[PDB]
Amino acid sequence: EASLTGAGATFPAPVYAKWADTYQKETGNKVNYQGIGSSGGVKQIIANTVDFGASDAPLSDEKLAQEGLFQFPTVIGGVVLAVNIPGLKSGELVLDGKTLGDIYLGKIKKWDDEAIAKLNPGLKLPSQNIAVVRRADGSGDSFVFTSYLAKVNEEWKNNVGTGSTVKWPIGLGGKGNDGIAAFVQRLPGAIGYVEYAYAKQNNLAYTKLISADGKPVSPTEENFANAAKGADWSKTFAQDLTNQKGEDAWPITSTTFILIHKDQKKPEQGTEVLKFFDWAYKTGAKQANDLDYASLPDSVVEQVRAAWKTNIKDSSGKPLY
């Protein structure tokens, strides 16, 4: 029985925690996962203080080659906007990318602003001031979210840009997805971006968003999968799944990655990391789905297995899978 440690992205933590629990019950293996944010996950795997790092923001082929890392996707989730708006219920407010960007830019300051009202004809929005909440830590959710905003709001694109950390024009900082959820829960008028599971498990209200094709879509496991249907995984695992075309494609969708060293110094550890994840691909789909994460098509899993065989080796050139 082995003891494994991973660290990183909080975006898929509920599901990694769930698979780890079940895995130990079935095999005795212990996987300790520390949700410290994607930036910390990358730092940690590079520093070698953990068996695997976890990041929602992919590293480029060159950065991977430079650090001797291999990257592979696990599940598909979505970022949603949790809101604390008195009198409104979950899923009732619709926002589009442009407006969402203006809220984050500080341009829109009240919930009954004309821009919001026009996207929500039937709604009676309070004249409550918006309290924007964002991540205090280096985050893959920030990356994904800013990647989205830069595509739909030109001003965001030009003044703040994209990144795990950016100069936020406004807002209170929350540490981790947990942090943002707690903030939104206690602040009337709050809006923060969290991975979907965090909104659901905390009973937070969330909004619908307008798809790239222009229709209001609700964030669901199936709508995350829908945004991923046209991804050409055979070309690369680092797919940009934000603002994708298609029927019911959630606009802020993202897969998330596991990073491991290609030249395993502790071959025994590396072998157990791959079994853990191979086990998760073969039997963990129902747990992912229970938490509203969409699974990767079997074809992508076979591609990952094929890449593990050609890329992960011990110091003697022997493959670990």
Q: What angle in degrees, to the nearest 10, is found between the helix axes of 140-152 and 97-105?
A: 110
Q: Which of 304, 240, 237, 264 is nearest to 45 (CA)?
A: 264
Distance CA 235, CA 231 (A): 9
Q: What are phi and psi of 319, to 5 degrees?
A: -65, 150
Residue that is written with structure tokens 């829960």 in the block: 185
Closest by alpha carbon to 84, among 194, 170, 187? 187
Greatest alpha-carbon span in the chain = 67
- Name 65's Cβ contacts closer than 8 Å, sequence gap at least 6: none
Method: X-ray
Enumerate the CATH 3.40.190.10 domain ranges in the chain, comma separated. Answer: 1-77+230-239+254-321, 78-229+240-253
Q: Is 216 helix (H, G, I), strand (E, B) or coil?
A: strand
Fold (topology level) of 78-229+240-253: D-Maltodextrin-Binding Protein; domain 2 (3.40.190)
Q: Are strands 208-210 and 3-8 parallel, antiparallel or unpaired?
A: unpaired
Distance separating alpha carbons of residues 310 and 321, to the nearest angstrom: 9
Closest CA to 224 of 139, 296, 143, 300: 296
Strand partners, 255: 76
For the segment(s) 1-77+230-239+254-321, the CATH number from 3.30.750.24, 3.40.190.10, 3.30.420.10, 3.40.50.2300 is 3.40.190.10
Contacts 24+ apart (CB under 8 A), 212-217: 212/243, 212/244, 212/245, 212/246, 212/249, 212/251, 213/245, 213/246, 213/247, 213/249, 215/247, 215/248, 216/94, 217/248, 217/249, 217/250, 217/251
Beta strands in the chain (DSSP E): 3-8, 30-35, 52-55, 69-83, 94-95, 131-135, 172-174, 190-195, 205-206, 208-210, 216-217, 253-261, 263-264, 313-314
Helices 267-283, 298-311: crossing angle, 10 deg rounding: 170
Resolution (A): 1.9
Q: Determine the straight-line distance between the first and last CA of the chain, rounded to whole angstroms.
A: 18
The Cα–Cα gap between 37 and 81 comes to 18
What is the Cα–Cα distance from 52 to 20, expressed in whole angstroms? Answer: 14
Rounded Cα distance, 28 and 31, in Å: 10
Distances (CA, A) of 87 to 79, 124, 188: 23, 9, 11
211 and 97 Cβ atoms separated by less than 8 Å: no
